[PDB]
Amino acid sequence: PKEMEEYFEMLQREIDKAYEIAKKARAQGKDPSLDVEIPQATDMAGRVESLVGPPGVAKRIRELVKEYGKEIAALKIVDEIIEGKFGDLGSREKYAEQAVRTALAILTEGIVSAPIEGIANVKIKRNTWADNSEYLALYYAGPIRSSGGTAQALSVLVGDYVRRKLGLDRFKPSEKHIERMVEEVDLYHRAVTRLQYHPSPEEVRLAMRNIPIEITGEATDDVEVSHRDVPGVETNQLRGGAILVLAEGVLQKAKKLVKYIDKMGIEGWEWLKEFVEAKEKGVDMGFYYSLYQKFKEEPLFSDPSKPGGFRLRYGRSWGINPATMILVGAVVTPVTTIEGPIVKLKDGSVLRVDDYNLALKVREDVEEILYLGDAVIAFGDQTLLPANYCEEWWILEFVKALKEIYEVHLEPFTENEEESIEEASDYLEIDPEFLKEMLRDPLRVKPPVELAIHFSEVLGIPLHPYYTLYWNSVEPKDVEKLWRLLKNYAEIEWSNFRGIKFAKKIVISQEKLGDSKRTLELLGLPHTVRDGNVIVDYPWAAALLTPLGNLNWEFMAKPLYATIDIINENNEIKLRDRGISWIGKPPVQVLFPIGLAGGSSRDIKKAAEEGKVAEVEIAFFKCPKCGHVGPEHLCPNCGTRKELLWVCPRCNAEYPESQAEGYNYTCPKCNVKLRPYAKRKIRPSELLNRAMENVKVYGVDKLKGVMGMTSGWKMPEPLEKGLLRAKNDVYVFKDGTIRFDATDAPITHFRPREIGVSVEKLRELGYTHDFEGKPLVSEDQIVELKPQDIILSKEAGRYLLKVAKFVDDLLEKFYGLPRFYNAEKMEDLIGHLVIGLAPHTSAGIVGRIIGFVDALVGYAHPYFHAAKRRNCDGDEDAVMLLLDALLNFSRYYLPEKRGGKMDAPLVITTRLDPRYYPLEFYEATYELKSPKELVGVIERVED
Template sequence: AQKAPKVWRQLQKWGKDMDLEHWNFLSEFVELQKKIKAKGKVKDDKSEKIAPDYTYIKDLVGGRPVLGHPLREGTLRLRYGRARVSGLSSSAIHPATQVVLNGYIAIGTHIKTERPMKGSVLALCDTIEGPIVKLKNGNVVKLDNFEKAKNYVKDIIEVLYLGDILINYELFLNRAHKLVPAGFCPEWWVYYVDKEKASDKELVEKLIRDPLQTKITFEQAEKISQETGAPLHPDYIFFWNAIQPKDFLNFFNHIKNASIQPNKIIVPWDDEVKRSLELIGIPHTAVMNEYVVIEEPYNKALLANIGNFERFPSLLDSPLDMVNQVSKYKIMDKLGTFIGSRMGRPEKAKMRKLTGSPQVLFPVGEEGGRLRCFQSALEAGKVTAEFPIYFCDKCNRNTIYKVCEVCGNKTQKRYYCRQCKKEIESEECPKHGPDSVIPYKRQEIDIRHYYEHALRLVGERSGPPLVKGVRGTTNIDHIPEHLAKGILRAKYEIYVNKEGTTRYDMTEMACTHFKPAEVGTSIEKLKELGYTHDIYGEELKDDNQIIELKPQDFILPACDEAMEEGADKVFLRVGKFIDEMLEKLYGMKAFYNFNKPEDIIGHLFVSLSPHTSAGVIIRAIGFSKTQGFLAHPLLHCLMRRDCDSDEAGVMLLLDALINFSRGYLPNTRGITQDTPLVLTSTLLPSEVDDQILDMDVCWRYPLELYESALEYKQPWEVDIETYSKRLGKEEQYEGLGFTHHTSDLNNGIRCSAYKSLPSMEDKVKGQMDIAAKLRAVDTDDVAKLVIERHFIRDIKGNLRKFSMQQFRCVKCNEKFR
């Protein structure tokens, strides 16, 4: 049912040619599905085009705030485009939006959305609109940068507009969602500017070339509209359709009769006019509940919008149409479409730990105590568990290793007959055949013997204060790791995964371009790695030049604000562990020789995603200050993933080559998933997940997209260059475009407040505080959903568990009921 829209999209293209007309029932099913999700409700002004979708909000979780109800004005406004750190199901918001949400939404945080996708991981883009907020003193302020937002956040009483969410064309195309109107924006506006008619051709050329980063004054914008007939620039228009027609008439009369001065407009206080000013998004100052003052440049912009006082607007259905009756210039709709959303999973970047946080896949049995540590087992002097059976001819004794820990000779494999209850030398018992023979037996070993020899092997006298193992091995042959590896891992404070490696898990985030300053890598090092020129063909000289990321390179997370250690610190220690292991266990030279995190740059890793068994060889080229796995969309698709909250793990290549063993994997169904059974070193775009084919790769969207969105056309009716058009060509690996610049991908909230708050009470309080100040959120509905959808269900589950509770002995872990 979830895939019905995507299936129907394909059937519309080739269903008739394949004689699949009997699947046309999907058309009715998709329409019915939309109606059910909308709860039978539709938007007044778009009743035949778009309906609210409540799916994302019906399973609300306590502590994770709602950012906006479906299609509610004031929540995230749709902006078409792709930043260099978005795409492939991820989107971008303004850094100031993070601040007004009290830090709950960080870089890499997942949100569930109303449309066009079910969910998305959020990155940053500061060339889109930020929030408009009302302060405690009544002032209305537009927050257009991160620092400004931090200065005002404590004084915010209401968030009138949350800001834009940047969603690229790919998501509408891939999800088979019809295009919906966007609010008027600079990249749309430039299509109406006729350069030949403008007197300041240099400015206009600059605007056309880069409409987002080229800022113009009101006087310049007005002059361009006068000369070229273009609509007034989006920076100087307002959300006129956010008020009612009758409210506009009242507003118009008050502005007409206000004190209009050269540098400001002073409006006598009126509650309805004040609210209209707030809703249409005009920054202003409230003076003692007596006056409202609109200062430059917004006073001039307002007069350009409605300052033709010789005319009087007639009452129409749309306030925007009424504005255009009295405006000096063409005024476009700035509202567009608002997209409801709520917080999903917080961002993640941490070393993977198994239950009990073991450092070696070596059993400690019940003797390991509740911590499953060797220190407890050493006190007991033994470990009782399943171990393989080997025999050393030279020492004339049994051991659990393939190589004797005493003399270093290779040992002989022995077996155990369960019926004879004795060890044998072959896989088949002479009396009972092969069915009764197993390659291990439950035995009691002298743990002090093995531990002391492991210490001697690694050159340690006493070893770390705590070394943790597993209760028992779960692989089919009960093969343990060498105990010396656990001692070394404990020395470097790293942990082992089920297959013998040390894995670091991260939230997947798309990235096609980066700046050297953002990843902390020197120009010289980047040139060594093959990054010699920026996207404009200029030689790499400056830390702020934009460089295109190579498909099999990635950026590791090193977030100081995170609750867990960054990958820089973890892999620095992993590299030291591997070097000492090579020297002490294998008698080889050290390979990595890491002394500082920067030494990791340029080395090879293996990336792996859940439910797959093929690792991909990749290269680290720097560290971001986020908690995301920043990688090329092609790499994400090679791992059969996108960026809608999926996670991926990485490990050092040598760790995988030396320490991974299929023999360590538990003997359970599906356990070979999420393990590097095979490695691939070549990325072939024709063999990756097909979502990449729908990703737009252009540098600018055409006017056709914005005009088609006004008519709610299907995305495939618009001709935009997608990756599918580059497949098999030389440019399939490089030259990808993006539409919106980001000054710094790290400059925002990097760790969600949700993760740092200690209790559910604090999290829910924060959730309700956010709901109370967001105009687009119904606070009562949020409280109702949290209680009904989360707390009542949890209480029922807790009562059930309470009635079945057990008691555990803290010494031996025995459970009683």
């Protein structure tokens, strides 16, 4: 649709405006990179290319996914990479690395960080202790944990496919290789991290003897092992990344992994299928009174007489009348054919409200909601509730009676044969066009009460449910009382249709009726109060008196009988129950290490004020122009971009980036690897005073940094960024972003009034029509939510306003750029963009703020925060302002070792591109079955 395409284009314009500002800011060289560190993508193909490449892959992925699906496509890409279709990548090791990252990113839809943060390296090595044959090794980093077990297990299968395509042999561990792993898993689980799945020593041996690649990595934890100096294992400490992949990946997710091996047809994994099966192999009573009794056996201020909730309605696939939306995981959808609420007005009048227009008219006069309305819930879903009598059930009984009595064959919810409609019309004394419409749409086309009664009389069918009151909501003793008051004090006007005598109008004094007025309300009887009288007009006078036999038989309360049981025992016209079932800190301002110098609160301002010196592991930069050394990116003397100094951890020799690159990040006269940082003496007073001068902000209360950096780089964030955060009362996350940790609920529809946004604002946002396709002109209209449009809580809005003020201060004071947001109130953020990031994911989704709710839980479209991610059991989301993330996020701030629940936005997604049950079903709900038993019932009926 052109409306959706225009929406996606509007978002691109807004995204591009944010990237142009951030590119200008980053070009200045005050940050770890001269570029914006968050690439954007349209789709999973684009996510793959943007994250790990190779260039031109996204185009191939689209073609391959369209032909073969995601799983097979990943293998086809590995083949093409190795064949050189994406250019000469150089060494077999560079081809292996590219094919590993790309294929794993394809399989994980570019949603997780395993291809970037999880795999540090891919190496070709030899089984020197064995046959000296070549094999593939994957070097896993501790942050692999952030991607979940499924991603970890798939990296192993990808590694195996890649090594086979490169013609490499299998990894053939020595007995010392296997035992070191057994030891490592034990020591890791015991004192580092408790494994989600803790394998037995023999399970570790099984995995180790059968995984065809080496699951390895650099040391993640300073914990010495006893199986030391193993050939090919370049550490004597714990390889946490590897341990996680083996236990929490391959063994924990072994059942999910075998499904992938099956979809992909990879051989040599029978040992894993055998592991999965081994884990598996080791006085009389009334009908309704009886039904309500069995039904029980299977808020304190609330009215006991009033049943709580919506009237259950089984759907063949949630569904709510627009009038109940105005007057009152699951997603609500407007359905105009089902029933709305039953309301009592201030004047005492009782009314059914089944349309949007009537709901608006009575809204100001509603005194009580007697009945909430229907809720259409799909049977697809374990105790199953008895079905409420409804038009769907009644129409089936109506057509069964025509077949049984007259041999006329008719079907509901379809076009019928003219001759059959005519035959039945002649027997029923009705209009063929009326019958056609009632059969086609029984929820919309109801007969008048006299014809409903005539249908029951002729066909022996229960009274139509539209004319069935909530008889069983009332105790039989109260119907008995009501009966006497009507018999003695009511003035009744009668009518006669084809020999059927029925009530046309009931007039009873409010005085004479008394307490029984409450019985009429509980019955859901529509009535009016005028001139001290209760008046029951047509068709409701017959709905009341026809089940009571026009007061020709006396209603008497009987023990162990429900009201409908008494009616059904004594009345010619029979009923079914229309209402039996009812439903319903933070502690950091700047990423800057202060050690113990800022006391217990890591206060940089206190450290600088007390003239304290800090000894912290921190990265230093050398100026090539003058020679200045310090923790900043730009030179404070000549303003030229400074070069990172690499340090040898032994001789403490300093080597600038280019010199370190020549020496392959290894000291030229020590065989030990260089570090981008060292333990250094820091003088916060000179650093903070310069930062204060730069941004012209002095009056900060406190400035909370970190005790130490958890990144591999230990490259601090500029203090200027912290000063502006403290000024704006905002706090930073580990990666340089500011996040609001929210809980959101899925929605598909909204009303402007409910989100506190005007019709004109929404028209400017591109909303043209309501759910019915009618022009959007009222704040009360029900509107369909656009896929990336989100409603935040007022709590989110209150914090985000502060973030917008920090971004604007940063742009102007630190970057010398114009302000962007200019927000004073949270409503100024409507139309502005955010990044939504779910737990265990590294692909954020672009969202547009369209409104705010007074509640703690915000709203988003089901596509924005999928039920699948919500089943990876995080209803929590993190929200960042788009521009805050583009300016302030850096991969150089990512944790080196710890992989938690919350990951980073490694990429952002800019586009989110997208009859009836048989009679036997309804009858079977009365015999209290489960849906397993009932699906069998429906499947057998559909021969």
